[PDB]
Amino acid sequence: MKNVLIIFGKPYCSICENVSDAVEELKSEYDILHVDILSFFLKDGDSSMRGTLIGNFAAHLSNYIVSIFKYNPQTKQMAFVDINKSLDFTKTDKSLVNLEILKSEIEKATYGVWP
Protein backbone atom coordinates (compact mmCIF):
# COMPACT_ATOMS: atom_id res chain seq x y z
CA MET A 1 0.00 0.00 0.00
CA LYS A 2 1.29 3.46 -0.87
CA ASN A 3 2.46 5.77 1.84
CA VAL A 4 0.88 9.22 2.00
CA LEU A 5 2.61 12.59 1.63
CA ILE A 6 0.72 15.36 3.43
CA ILE A 7 1.46 18.84 2.16
CA PHE A 8 0.57 21.94 4.22
CA GLY A 9 0.56 25.45 2.75
CA LYS A 10 -1.66 28.37 1.72
CA PRO A 11 -3.99 27.55 -1.16
CA TYR A 12 -3.72 29.61 -4.35
CA CYS A 13 -0.11 30.68 -4.05
CA SER A 14 2.88 30.01 -6.28
CA ILE A 15 5.20 28.46 -3.70
CA CYS A 16 2.93 25.73 -2.36
CA GLU A 17 1.64 25.17 -5.92
CA ASN A 18 5.15 24.63 -7.34
CA VAL A 19 5.98 22.28 -4.50
CA SER A 20 2.75 20.25 -5.03
CA ASP A 21 3.55 20.16 -8.74
CA ALA A 22 6.98 18.66 -8.09
CA VAL A 23 5.48 16.24 -5.59
CA GLU A 24 2.94 15.12 -8.24
CA GLU A 25 5.76 13.57 -10.26
CA LEU A 26 6.04 11.05 -7.40
CA LYS A 27 2.34 9.92 -7.65
CA SER A 28 3.29 6.41 -8.73
CA GLU A 29 5.03 6.12 -5.35
CA TYR A 30 2.89 8.11 -2.91
CA ASP A 31 -0.69 9.12 -2.35
CA ILE A 32 -0.85 12.91 -1.87
CA LEU A 33 -3.09 15.01 0.35
CA HIS A 34 -3.29 18.78 0.80
CA VAL A 35 -4.11 20.60 3.96
CA ASP A 36 -4.89 24.21 3.17
CA ILE A 37 -3.87 26.79 5.70
CA LEU A 38 -6.69 29.32 5.60
CA SER A 39 -6.08 31.71 8.44
CA PHE A 40 -3.29 33.75 10.02
CA PHE A 41 -3.27 35.97 13.09
CA LEU A 42 -0.40 38.11 14.32
CA LYS A 43 -0.56 37.71 18.13
CA ASP A 44 -2.23 40.62 19.90
CA GLY A 45 0.81 41.26 22.13
CA ASP A 46 3.28 41.35 19.23
CA SER A 47 0.99 43.86 17.49
CA SER A 48 1.80 46.36 20.28
CA MET A 49 5.45 46.99 19.32
CA ARG A 50 11.43 50.00 12.81
CA GLY A 51 7.96 50.40 11.31
CA THR A 52 5.01 47.96 11.21
CA LEU A 53 6.25 47.36 7.66
CA ILE A 54 7.71 44.31 9.45
CA GLY A 55 4.14 43.35 10.40
CA ASN A 56 3.04 43.24 6.74
CA PHE A 57 6.31 41.46 6.04
CA ALA A 58 5.51 38.68 8.55
CA ALA A 59 2.04 38.49 6.99
CA HIS A 60 3.64 38.12 3.53
CA LEU A 61 5.86 35.23 4.73
CA SER A 62 2.66 33.17 5.07
CA ASN A 63 3.12 32.65 1.32
CA TYR A 64 6.29 30.69 2.02
CA ILE A 65 4.97 28.25 4.61
CA VAL A 66 5.23 24.73 3.25
CA SER A 67 5.57 21.51 5.16
CA ILE A 68 5.57 17.89 4.03
CA PHE A 69 4.82 14.86 6.19
CA LYS A 70 5.04 11.21 5.26
CA TYR A 71 2.33 8.96 6.71
CA ASN A 72 2.42 5.16 6.64
CA PRO A 73 -1.21 3.92 6.79
CA GLN A 74 -0.22 0.31 7.48
CA THR A 75 2.29 0.92 10.31
CA LYS A 76 0.40 4.06 11.43
CA GLN A 77 3.72 5.90 11.71
CA MET A 78 4.57 9.41 10.75
CA ALA A 79 7.66 11.13 9.36
CA PHE A 80 8.85 14.74 9.19
CA VAL A 81 10.36 15.58 5.81
CA ASP A 82 13.38 17.96 5.85
CA ILE A 83 12.73 19.88 2.61
CA ASN A 84 14.77 23.09 3.02
CA LYS A 85 17.83 21.93 1.00
CA SER A 86 15.60 21.24 -2.04
CA LEU A 87 14.16 24.77 -1.85
CA ASP A 88 15.46 28.07 -3.19
CA PHE A 89 12.92 30.88 -2.61
CA THR A 90 15.15 33.34 -4.57
CA LYS A 91 13.78 31.60 -7.69
CA THR A 92 10.54 32.08 -9.67
CA ASP A 93 9.62 28.97 -11.72
CA LYS A 94 10.31 25.21 -11.55
CA SER A 95 13.85 25.92 -10.23
CA LEU A 96 12.15 26.83 -6.95
CA VAL A 97 12.07 23.06 -6.35
CA ASN A 98 14.79 20.55 -7.12
CA LEU A 99 12.94 17.25 -7.49
CA GLU A 100 15.94 14.96 -7.09
CA ILE A 101 16.82 16.45 -3.68
CA LEU A 102 13.17 16.51 -2.65
CA LYS A 103 12.79 12.84 -3.61
CA SER A 104 15.86 11.92 -1.50
CA GLU A 105 14.65 13.93 1.50
CA ILE A 106 11.19 12.34 1.34
CA GLU A 107 12.68 8.88 1.01
CA LYS A 108 15.12 9.22 3.95
CA ALA A 109 12.59 10.73 6.37
CA THR A 110 12.44 8.46 9.43
CA TYR A 111 9.22 7.10 10.94
CA GLY A 112 7.96 7.37 14.50
CA VAL A 113 4.96 7.33 16.79
CA TRP A 114 4.53 10.83 18.31
CA PRO A 115 2.33 10.98 21.46
Swiss-Prot record:
It holds the Pfam family Glrx-like. It comes from the Viruses. The keyword Transport applies. GO terms for cellular component: host cell cytoplasm. Disulfide bonds join 13-16. SUPFAM superfamilies: Thioredoxin-like. Keywords: Disulfide bond, Electron transport, Host cytoplasm, Redox-active center, Transport. Induction: Expressed in the intermediate phase of the viral replicative cycle. It is found in: Host cytoplasm. Homodimer. Glutaredoxin necessary for virion morphogenesis and virus replication. Functions as a thiol-disulfide transfer protein between membrane-associated OPG128/A2.5 and substrates OPG095/L1 or OPG053/F9. The complete pathway for formation of disulfide bonds in intracellular virion membrane proteins sequentially involves oxidation of OPG072/E10, OPG128/A2.5 and OPG088/G4. Exhibit thioltransferase and dehydroascorbate reductase activities in vitro. This is Glutaredoxin-2. It comes from Vaccinia virus (strain Western Reserve) (VACV). The lineage of its organism: Viruses, Varidnaviria, Bamfordvirae, Nucleocytoviricota, Pokkesviricetes.
